[PDB]
Amino acid sequence: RPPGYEDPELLASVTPFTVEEVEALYELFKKLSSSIIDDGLIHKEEFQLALFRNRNRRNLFADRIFDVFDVKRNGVIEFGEFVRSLGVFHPSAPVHEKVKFAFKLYDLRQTGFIEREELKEMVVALLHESELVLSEDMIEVMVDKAFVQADRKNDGKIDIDEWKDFVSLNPSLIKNMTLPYLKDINRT
Amino acid sequence: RPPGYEDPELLASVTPFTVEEVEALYELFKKLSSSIIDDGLIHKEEFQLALFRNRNRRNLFADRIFDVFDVKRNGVIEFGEFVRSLGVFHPSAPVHEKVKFAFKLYDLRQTGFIEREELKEMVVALLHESELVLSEDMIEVMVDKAFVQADRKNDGKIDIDEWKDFVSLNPSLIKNMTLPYLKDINRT
Ligand SMILES: [Ca+2]
Ligand SMILES: [Ca+2]
Ligand SMILES: [Ca+2]
Ligand SMILES: [Ca+2]
Ligand SMILES: [Ca+2]
Ligand SMILES: [Ca+2]
Ligand SMILES: [Ca+2]
Ligand SMILES: [Ca+2]
């Protein structure tokens, strides 16, 4: 009847998941939150491991993922934070939440905008996801074109509205904002 | 005890498949070879349909795939031609066969080499596979760089040896030369 306890019906009702899926994700949370410390929290040390091990997103953005998973900004990931952040990757999650999440992700230093050098590290990382590794001048041409396309109110930084415009023209930037195995999950 | 008959053990023994998988692929061949004419042959009219329907590779290269599937150059695909060509996409198929197959595929007009304008239509099609649609001058820069990289014996056309060199540096050009569902197949 314990501390940290959260009725799975609760998360079920605010996410694309169901009770059984929420209960299921609790098993997976116990795994990741116990690796090193056994306090019911996923320390970032243990987030790394879990992404490193059962590969999901990407190693160099784990500090980025960890950071946005960390909704109540307090240095760790709690169970409900973990389920709600994951729920955003669900195929039925509203595209709004996916666009927003992707935006926090790319705001590399957490400043409320996307600056050119962050669009760059972004584009590089996405390219490399699709096994394309291009010359540095191929890249700043690309990044330059995409950056003036995106920076509508011409002022050197992308805000969430221009991002939304930008992504509507570039829907593949939020390609990975959805993981299709999450529709019915796989016991292990 | 019929015409067209081929002992599945035969194909089993010359391809990564097993008897049961060969027998299985016969069911799938009957489907595709009967759509329009019921002669035990996949006419190209019926190859289109099958790629169009249960999507596999890509629509504009169906005439290219059809063409290399068509090993005994005679305008149709016979059962054993179909199993042997498919077997090449198997995860355990030797990389040699994958490189060779990919080469015949890109030799768009069938001239025994890859010419610059074919590397171009190639690169465009691969880019578009990974949801990247680039400016025409981004593209001839890319195609120009890749083309002089590949055209070692400097003479305006890529032969199979230079292709093999080229692909060893660019292993993602034969990414699609493997279909992982083929490891154990899916009844329908
Ligand atoms: Ca812990
Ligand atoms: Ca937190
Ligand atoms: Ca930022
Ligand atoms: Ca702006
Ligand atoms: Ca037929
Ligand atoms: Ca033939
Ligand atoms: Ca050619
Ligand atoms: Ca050459």
Total number of residues shown for chain A: 188
Q: Would you call A173 exposed, middle or buried from its count of C-beta atoms within 10 A (0-12, 13-18, 19+)? A: buried
Contact criterion met (CB below 8 Å) for B107 and B96: no
Total number of residues shown for chain B: 188
> Which method was used?
X-ray
- Which one, of B60, B27, B30, lies nearest residue B46 by Cα? B30
CA A129 to chain centre: 15
- Give backbone dihedrals phi and psi of B157, rounded to 5 degrees, phi first: -155, 145
Closest residue in A to B138 (Cα) is: A138
Interface test with B, best of A124, A128, A131 (most B CBs within 10 A): A131
Resolution to 1 decimal place, in Å: 2.7
For chain A, the maximum distance between any two Cα atoms, rounded to a whole number of angstroms, is 60
CA distance linking residue B89 with residue B179, whole number of Å: 6
Distance from B138 to chain A by nearest Cα, in Å? 8
Q: Would you call A72 exposed, middle or buried from its count of C-beta atoms within 10 A (0-12, 13-18, 19+)? A: exposed
Evaluate the CA torsion angle A125, A126, A129, A133 in order and state its sign.
negative
Size of interface A-B (CB pairs under 8 A): 19
Q: What is the DSSP pairing of strand A114-115 with strand B114-115?
A: unpaired
Domain carrying residue B70: 1-188
Q: How far is the CA of A52 from the centre of ligand 1 (A)?
A: 16
* Count of the separate structural domains present in chain B: 1
Identify all chain B residues contacting A175, using CB atoms and an 8 Å cutoff. 131
Q: Which ligand number lies closest to the CA of residue A36?
A: 1
Q: How far is the CA of A108 from the centre of ligand 3 (A)?
A: 5
Q: For residue A148, what are its two tokens?
A: 């003036």
Q: For residue A172, what are its two tokens?
A: 């593949």
Expressed in angstroms, the distance from the first to the final Cα of chain B is 26
Q: For residue B55, what are its two tokens?
A: 């999507």
CA A185 to chain centre: 19
CA distance linking residue A124 with residue A121, whole number of Å: 5
Contact B172 A138 (CB under 8 A): no
Contact criterion met (CB below 8 Å) for A139 and A125: no
Interface test with A, best of B124, B129, B132, B170 (most A CBs within 10 A): B132
- Give backbone dihedrals phi and psi of A157, rounded to 5 degrees, phi first: -155, 145
* A156: region left, alpha or beta (phi > 0 left; psi from -120 to 50 alpha): left
Breaks in chain B, after residue numbers (C to N greater than 2.5 Å): none
Give the other-Cβ count within 10 Å of B102's Cβ. Answer: 20
Give me the residue from A138, A145, A172 closest to B131, CB to CB.
A172
Identify all chain B residues contacting A135, using CB atoms and an 8 Å cutoff. 145
> For residues A16, A20, A24 and A26, what is the CA-based torsion angle, rounded to 10 degrees?
80
CA distance linking residue A77 with residue A74, whole number of Å: 8
Identify all chain A residues contacting B172, using CB atoms and an 8 Å cutoff. 131-132
Distance from A92 to chain B by nearest Cα, in Å? 22
CA distance linking residue A149 with residue B54, whole number of Å: 37
Expressed in angstroms, the distance from the first to the final Cα of chain A is 26
- Which one, of B13, B55, B49, B19, lies nearest residue B31 by Cα? B49
**CATH code of the domain in which B37 resides:** 1.10.238.10
Q: For residue B76, what are its two tokens?
A: 């149709």
CA distance linking residue A178 with residue A87, whole number of Å: 9
CA distance linking residue B187 with residue B184, whole number of Å: 10
- Which one, of B95, B96, B87, B114, lies nearest residue B25 by Cα? B87
CA distance linking residue A57 with residue A54, whole number of Å: 10
Q: What is the 3-state secondary structure (H, E, C) of chain A?
A: CCCCCCCHHHHHCCCCCCHHHHHHHHHHHHHHCCCCCCCCCECHHHHHHHHHCCCCCCHHHHHHHHHHHCCCCCCCECHHHHHHHHHCCCCCCCHHHHHHHHHHHHCCCCCCCEEHHHHHHHHHHHHHHCCCCCCHHHHHHHHHHHHHHHCCCCCCEECHHHHHHHHHHCHHHHHHHCCHHHHCCCCC
Q: For residue B82, what are its two tokens?
A: 């179909």
Contact criterion met (CB below 8 Å) for B60 and B108: no
Question: What residues pair up with A114 in beta bridges, in sequence order?
Answer: A158
CA distance linking residue A36 with residue A142, whole number of Å: 42
- Which one, of B126, B112, B89, lies nearest residue B161 by Cα? B112
Give me the residue from B130, B135, B138 closest to A130, CB to CB.
B130
Return all residues near A131 (Cβ < 8 A) that are at least 6 apart.
B130, B172, B175
Q: What is the DSSP pairing of strand A157-158 with strand B114-115?
A: unpaired
